[PDB]
Amino acid sequence: MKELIYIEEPKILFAHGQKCTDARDGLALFGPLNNLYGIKSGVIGTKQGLKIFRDYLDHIQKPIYNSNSITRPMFPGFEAVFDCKWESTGITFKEVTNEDIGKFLYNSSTHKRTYDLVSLFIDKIISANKNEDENVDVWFVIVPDEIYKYCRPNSVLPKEMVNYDAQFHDQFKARLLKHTIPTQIFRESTLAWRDFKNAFGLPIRDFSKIEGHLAWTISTAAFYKAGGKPWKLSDVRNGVCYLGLVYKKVEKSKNPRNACCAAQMFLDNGDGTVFKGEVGPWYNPKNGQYHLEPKEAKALLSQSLQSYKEQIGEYPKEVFIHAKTRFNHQEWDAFLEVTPKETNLVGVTISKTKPLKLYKTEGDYTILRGNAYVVNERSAFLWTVGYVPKIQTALSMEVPNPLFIEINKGEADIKQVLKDILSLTKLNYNACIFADGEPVTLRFADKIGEILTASTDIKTPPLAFKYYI
Amino acid sequence: VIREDTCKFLLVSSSYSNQREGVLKELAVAAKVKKQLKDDKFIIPLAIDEQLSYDDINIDIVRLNAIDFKMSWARGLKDILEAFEKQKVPKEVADASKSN
Amino acid sequence: NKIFISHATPDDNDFTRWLALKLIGLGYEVWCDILFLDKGVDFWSNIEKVIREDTCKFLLVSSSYSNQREGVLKELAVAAKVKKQLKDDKFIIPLAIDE
Amino acid sequence: RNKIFISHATPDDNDFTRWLALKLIGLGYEVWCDILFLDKGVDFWSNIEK
DNA sequence: ATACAACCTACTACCT
Numbered sequence: 001m002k003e004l005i006y007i008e009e010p011k012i013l014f015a016h017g018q019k020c021t022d023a024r025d026g027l028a029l030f031g032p033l034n035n036l037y038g039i040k041s042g043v044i045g046t047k048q049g050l051k052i053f054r055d056y057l058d059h060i061q062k063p064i065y066n067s068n069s070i071t072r073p074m075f076p077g078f079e080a081v082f083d084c085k086w087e088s089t090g091i092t093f094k095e096v097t098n099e100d101i102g103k104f105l106y107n108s109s110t111h112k113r114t115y116d117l118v119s120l121f122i123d124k125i126i127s128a129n130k131n132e133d134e135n136v137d138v139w140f141v142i143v144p145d146e147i148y149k150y151c152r153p154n155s156v157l158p159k160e161m162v163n164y165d166a167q168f169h170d171q172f173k174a175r176l177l178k179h180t181i182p183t184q185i186f187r188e189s190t191l192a193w194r195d196f197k198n199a200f201g202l203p204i205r206d207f208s209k210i211e212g213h214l215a216w217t218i219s220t221a222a223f224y225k226a227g228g229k230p231w232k233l234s235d236v237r238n239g240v241c242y243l244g245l246v247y248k249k250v251e252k253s254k255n256p257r258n259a260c261c262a263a264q265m266f267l268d269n270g271d272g273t274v275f276k277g278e279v280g281p282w283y284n285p286k287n288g289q290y291h292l293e294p295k296e297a298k299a300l301l302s303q304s305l306q307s308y309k310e311q312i313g314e315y316p317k318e319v320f321i322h323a324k325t326r327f328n329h330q331e332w333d334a335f336l337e338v339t340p341k342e343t344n345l346v347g348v349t350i351s352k353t354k355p356l357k358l359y360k361t362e363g364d365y366t367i368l369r370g371n372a373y374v375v376n377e378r379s380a381f382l383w384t385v386g387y388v389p390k391i392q393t394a395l396s397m398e399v400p401n402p403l404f405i406e407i408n409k410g411e412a413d414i415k416q417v418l419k420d421i422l423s424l425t426k427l428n429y430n431a432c433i434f435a436d437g438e439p440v441t442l443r444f445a446d447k448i449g450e451i452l453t454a455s456t457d458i459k460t461p462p463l464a465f466k467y468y469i
Numbered sequence: 470v471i472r473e474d475t476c477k478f479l480l481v482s483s484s485y486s487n488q489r490e491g492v493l494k495e496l497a498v499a500a501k502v503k504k505q506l507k508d509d510k511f512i513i514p515l516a517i518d519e520q521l522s523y524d525d526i527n528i529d530i531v532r533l534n535a536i537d538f539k540m541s542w543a544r545g546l547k548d549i550l551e552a553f554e555k556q557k558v559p560k561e562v563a564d565a566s567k568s569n
Numbered sequence: 570n571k572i573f574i575s576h577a578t579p580d581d582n583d584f585t586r587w588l589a590l591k592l593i594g595l596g597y598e599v600w601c602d603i604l605f606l607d608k609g610v611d612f613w614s615n616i617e618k619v620i621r622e623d624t625c626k627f628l629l630v631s632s633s634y635s636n637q638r639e640g641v642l643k644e645l646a647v648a649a650k651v652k653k654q655l656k657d658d659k660f661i662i663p664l665a666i667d668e
Numbered sequence: 669r670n671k672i673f674i675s676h677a678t679p680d681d682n683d684f685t686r687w688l689a690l691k692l693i694g695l696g697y698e699v700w701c702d703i704l705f706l707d708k709g710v711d712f713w714s715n716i717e718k
Numbered sequence: 719a720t721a722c723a724a725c726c727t728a729c730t731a732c733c734t
């Protein structure tokens with residue numbers, strides 16, 4: 001009968017140098033680190049979409065409550081939290097006609113339909129960015145639910161109503177990377193869930209008990225997209241750089257390729273957390289192989305080390321490479337040929353496939369979050385999802401799944417690796433929640449990869465995450 | 470504490486607190502101290518409930534100038550701080566460590 | 570269907586007693602704070618309830634003592650709100666008694 | 669007797685009233701306005717009358 | 719090209 005080890009919950013940092021575990025509570029009490037003056041919003045869509053967005057923007061300012069304010073904290077309003085203005089008066093409208101949407105919506109080919117709709121929105125975006133004298137921080141694209149339903153890669157258009165990825169969101173964000181415009185895509189049913197009902201006279205999506213959670217998530221995403229920093233890590237060490245590598249399949253070309261994207265996190269001399277991407281997805285011409293060539297591995301590590309040195313002044317002491325795959329010998333030897341003697345290379349594999357479930361004997365709740373089961377000096381299990389005493393509820397749904405964290409290559413302390421991963425799980429800026437399951441490096445590398453492998457014509461993409469997430 | 474300690478009496482005005490017995494007792498005690506202390510602005514109602522109309526506030530409050538928290542809490546807190554600095558309400562140096 | 574008379578309690582007692590008794594003798598329901606020998610625990614709450622739910626007219630004894638009396642002014646404000654609610658222009662009828 | 673009283677519809681004439689009050693204060697005139705000088709938690713009608 | 723084990727990704731569907 002085996003033993004477990006507990007890893008303390010990490011604390012994130014907020015305004016006035018105040019540490020907390022919950023992002024929502026820390027934002028409510030102290031506030032963001034940045035001082036944005038206000039958010040100027042550009043809205044694209046039909047007149048109904050503009051009305052929906054204006055109504056939601058007016059609704060945001062007033063406090064919003066949930067069914068339980070212990071499990072899910074309430075939203076006290078946008079300005080009361082972020083201390084900046086995001087009002088409906090600063091809205092810039094670029095109308096898209098319903099007739100124009102219907103002209104391209106009902107087409108035989110899903111590729112042609114999604115390309116036409118994506119181009120219809122992007123043409124207005126770029127025309128307003130270039131030929132209009134007003135400044136817009138974030139562009140909010142209100143999308144009718146038909147466009148969402150009928151633009152999926154595998155979606156089929158009913159016969160009665162009859163490169164680049166066949167997906168509205170990824171192709172939309174991939175074709176806007178040349179102009180560096182942060183965009184937030186909304187569905188009309190998200191902000192007006194009450195007005196869309198099913199055959200039984202009830203809404204399809206019920207946000208009655210989680211209205212404040214929706215407000216939290218939307219407001220945090222909008223604040224991050226406008227150039228604000230809501231929080232940052234507090235316990236991360238100096239001289240260590242975290243890398244996260246994700247491979248994606250590219251079906252745009254005739255020959256399948258495995259594009260590898262990365263995410264890089266570290267600490268600058270100003271105590272600010274530098275978290276960005278690592279792009280120019282290094283491809284592999286062999287189908288089914290998710291291992292980098294020596295040349296591409298050398299290029300990746302050289303670029304990462306050069307970026308770290310430029311931002312700091314010296315090469316990192318430690319480098320951690322979180323990947324969902326296992327590095328092989330040739331790729332690791334290629335990696336080691338770039339690192340200097342002072343830089344220690346550690347390659348960690350993070351997976352969620354191993355089926356180990358721990359059931360509490362005498363309760364209706366689940367295993368505590370932060371528990372670990374160190375298999376051996378190079379392998380452990382980490383429970384990043386589970387019961388959180390602070391919110392008196394579990395992040396998982398039925399029984400949480402563990403993360404099998406294994407130090408595949410290099411020498412490092414396994415407990416330190418688990419602590420680093422559990423601290424990374426607090427850096428998700430796409431959502432305003434308690435810490436999620438996967439580390440932020442792998443998740444954001446996946447988010448980058450899902451967009452960079454949509455459109456082929458991306459020479460040098462930006463590094464900021466507001467253009468991807 | 471109402472009689473000997475407080476310099477300002479903030480009252481959260483809502484539909485629940487409009488006719489609550491304990492809140493009314495505290496309001497009566499605060500009114501007594503306000504008359505004793507010759508302080509015209511001892512009681513400050515903060516209107517936070519949109520349901521409770523301005524025509525339904527209780528008799529001890531219907532004459533006072535309230536702070537509107539209905540539309541925005543940030544504006545209400547700005548008004549509270551502006552009144553506190555204008556009325557020379559005693560305060561120490563700001564410190565988030567106490568709140569934490 | 571009551572008639573509320575607002576006055577300074579110890580100063581305008583003669584005229585208030587005279588008018589209240591005269592109105593009672595003429596067939597009106599008069600609510601005055603001097604027409605209750607024993608006072609209950611809830612006075613101000615009961616006064617506001619009477620003004621909001623019972624009275625149809627609000628006679629104000631306008632004198633020098635009742636000009637700036639806190640209780641009279643509070644009742645006046647509540648009566649103004651009630652008059653606005655009932656859409657009656659002549660709900661409040663002041664009585665000038667002081668030279 | 670130095671104050672200058674400005675009467676207006678409180679939530680509808682706010683812009684012009686604020687503009688005029690700030691201007692008149694600019695040239696050294698003492699101005700009393702309910703949107704800039706009326707205290708909080710005070711008997712506002714008695715204060716206005718006084 | 720068949721059998722297996724040990725790893726890998728892509729694309730939905732439902733809950734709150």
Ligand SMILES: [Mg+2]
Nearest residue numbers: 221430431469
């Ligand atoms: Mg997002």
